[PDB]
């Protein structure tokens, strides 16, 4: 596959290519004008070097701010109101901090833990202007442990992970069904309207079980806590031996890809420098000539649908921290 | 004169020369090798894009990291052992942390806080190895403070900026020198052996005020607590019109500069935009056109004395800086 100077090198075109696009008030070259075109943003711009960019992207983020330290307009797409509302917050926290933009950083961060269930360190999935039951699910909760990561709240880090392991021990038919959401009380629901992966069929959603991976490796990373390492290894041993292929083929599989390139340079596994080899190879195979990322754009278009904006951004960040970390990791393993 | 595109285009020259010429092991071009030649590198290459090669820094710096959390070899430059220890630290802190290197700046950061005065919260200016009688001097607190924010231990750059307020108040004759460093009680020492920038002389040393006057602009964006705001900004009118025109010229300037650019973007007012602006634009125009910057060499090198490539990896980040604070606080301010 791909070597990790090929895999930046993707992601510094797509990158050059949403900044040539960016409008002047710092948004995203959008078809329709929210909060998730463009909530991975700082982040990725930021790796790629495109400082003033992702510093745009911080003037437009700040432009939204309410003074509680939400973003909840412009949101439209349901997943961002009542399936992982603090997706948007979660990078948007990271991406602040990381640019030293501390107030921004502090403010959204400080939001996140108002819906923190301190009971069970779930993050809750519906945001405060969206009626709900108080479920937590397993991306709100792991996007939110790392932004309190990388912003040094490690304590509601590791509430965080006590959440995912109690959602992982309580899995009623994992070989089955990976069901990502708890109640209130932490007990895993199963109700049709709450997320579930399919795992052994080729239906996408694995980013519910690739995301807290790489959280959780993260975690350990920080703390030394063989516990989160553990969970961590259980998940990606999960992913390759009990769900189908597509963990590591759907669009959603970059997450996992990341854990594996991280798990990698922390432990020295092979199987996790080939999971995140194969998964780096992907995207970097699916890339337009132009430079975006789109299961269905093929031409050479001045925006983008919001879901591959976001996807662009997206492949900027995970085939960047792919490349890093398969470089360090064969620095010091192989 | 230089726009902050053309800054940041500076930048990124010279992040490509560091990064041509990086050894197989991470570490930096240097003749001698130190850690001085190479502290700042994982923060500037980060923010010039080139995560890979920053990571390649953290692999060396991870290697040399001893328990205790320290970097106390290879060192040979006495400022770099009596004058302000912790100023290596403090970028190895920051570097590590942008980078998820979050084992890594977990035990840098806590090493940095046991040289922490818990009396007067400054840091200590002599590292373990090297006699001294607890002194702590504003480049060792001010960096310290900076990591501290960087890491989410704001309590400790609180801490470090009450240090700073109380060594700008305890000044005796602060018309003609800056005494830059207080006893393990707090008060201003004024004896020769001490650090004492002689403010209207064309000397140099100006980063003993320019690091303060950054990291409590930085501090005051994390916190909006004007109390930080006003000390940054006496600092800079102090600077700007107590202190020799050398303040903004010597190539100690950069911290200024930076401190200027986020004043602007924080406050609009137009003095500090032209005080970043000169400043960025004097480093543009001292920059190799092979892309480093050296004070005495002018070829196409293969590599440089440790602080040459200390001052080529520092103006990448600042120049980076300057250029996304200016950048913003003209679209906010427009």
Same mark, same amino acid.
């Given at each position: 596959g791909n070597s990790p100077h090929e895999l930046k090198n993707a992601a510094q075109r797509a990158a050059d290519?949403?900044?040539?696009?960016?409008?002047?008030?710092?948004?995203?070259?959008?078809?329709?004008?929210?909060?998730?075109?463009?909530?991975?943003?700082?982040?990725a711009?930021?790796t790629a070097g495109h400082?003033?960019?992702?510093?745009?992207?911080?003037?437009? #983020?700040?432009?939204?701010?309410?003074?509680?330290?939400?973003?909840?307009?412009?949101?439209?797409?349901?997943?961002?109101?009542?399936?992982?509302?603090?997706?948007?917050? !979660?990078?948007?926290?990271? !991406?602040?901090?990381?640019?030293?933009?501390?107030?921004?950083?502090?403010?959204? &961060?400080?939001?996140?833990?108002?819906?923190?269930?301190?009971?069970?360190?779930?993050?809750?999935?519906?945001?405060?202007?969206?009626?709900?039951? !108080?479920?937590? =699910?397993? #991306?709100?909760?792991?996007?939110?442990?790392?932004?309190?990561?990388?912003?040094?709240?490690?304590?509601?880090?590791?509430?965080?992970?006590?959440?995912?392991?109690?959602?992982?021990?309580?899995?009623?038919?994992?070989?089955?069904?990976?069901? @990502?959401?708890?109640?209130?009380?932490?007990?895993?629901?199963?109700?049709?309207?709450?997320?579930?992966?399919?795992?052994?069929?080729?239906?996408?959603?694995?980013?519910?079980?690739?995301?807290?991976?790489?959280?959780?490796?993260?975690?350990?990373?920080?703390?030394?806590?063989?516990?989160?390492?553990?969970?961590?290894?259980?998940?990606?041993?999960?992913?390759?031996?009990?769900?189908?292929? =597509?963990?590591?083929?759907?669009?959603?599989?970059g997450?996992?890809g990341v854990? @594996?390139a991280?798990?990698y340079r922390?432990?020295?596994?092979?199987?996790?420098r080939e999971?995140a080899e194969g998964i780096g190879t992907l995207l970097c195979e699916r890339q337009?000539?132009?430079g975006?990322?789109?299961?269905?754009?093929?031409? =050479? #278009?001045?925006?983008?649908?919001?879901? =591959?904006?976001? &996807?662009? @951004?997206?492949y900027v960040l995970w085939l960047d921290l792919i490349g890093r970390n398969l470089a360090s990791g064969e620095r010091v393993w192989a």
């Amino acid at each position: 596959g791909n070597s990790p100077h090929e895999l930046k090198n993707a992601a510094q075109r797509a990158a050059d290519w949403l900044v040539e696009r960016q409008r002047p008030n710092g948004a995203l070259p959008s078809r329709t004008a929210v909060i998730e075109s463009c909530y991975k943003g700082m982040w990725a711009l930021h790796t790629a070097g495109h400082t003033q960019a992702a510093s745009a992207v911080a003037d437009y #983020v700040t432009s939204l701010l309410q003074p509680d330290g939400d973003i909840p307009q412009p949101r439209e797409e349901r997943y961002f109101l009542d399936v992982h509302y603090l997706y948007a917050n !979660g990078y948007l926290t990271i !991406g602040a901090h990381v640019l030293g933009r501390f107030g921004l950083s502090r403010k959204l &961060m400080s939001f996140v833990e108002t819906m923190r269930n301190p009971a069970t360190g779930g993050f809750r999935s519906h945001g405060p202007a969206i009626p709900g039951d !108080g479920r937590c =699910d397993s #991306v709100s909760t792991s996007i939110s442990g790392l932004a309190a990561l990388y912003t040094g709240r490690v304590d509601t880090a590791r509430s965080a992970a006590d959440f995912l392991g109690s959602l992982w021990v309580g899995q009623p038919d994992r070989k089955n069904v990976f069901h @990502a959401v708890a109640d209130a009380s932490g007990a895993v629901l199963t109700s049709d309207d709450a997320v579930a992966v399919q795992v052994r069929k080729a239906e996408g959603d694995w980013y519910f079980i690739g995301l807290p991976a790489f959280f959780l490796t993260a975690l350990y990373e920080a703390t030394e806590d063989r516990a989160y390492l553990d969970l961590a290894t259980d998940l990606m041993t999960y992913m390759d031996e009990d769900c189908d292929e =597509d963990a590591f083929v759907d669009s959603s599989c970059g997450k996992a890809g990341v854990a @594996a390139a991280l798990l990698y340079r922390l432990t020295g596994r092979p199987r996790y420098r080939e999971i995140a080899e194969g998964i780096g190879t992907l995207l970097c195979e699916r890339q337009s000539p132009y430079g975006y990322w789109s299961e269905e754009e093929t031409g =050479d #278009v001045a925006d983008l649908f919001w879901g =591959d904006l976001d &996807m662009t @951004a997206e492949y900027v960040l995970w085939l960047d921290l792919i490349g890093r970390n398969l470089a360090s990791g064969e620095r010091v393993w192989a």
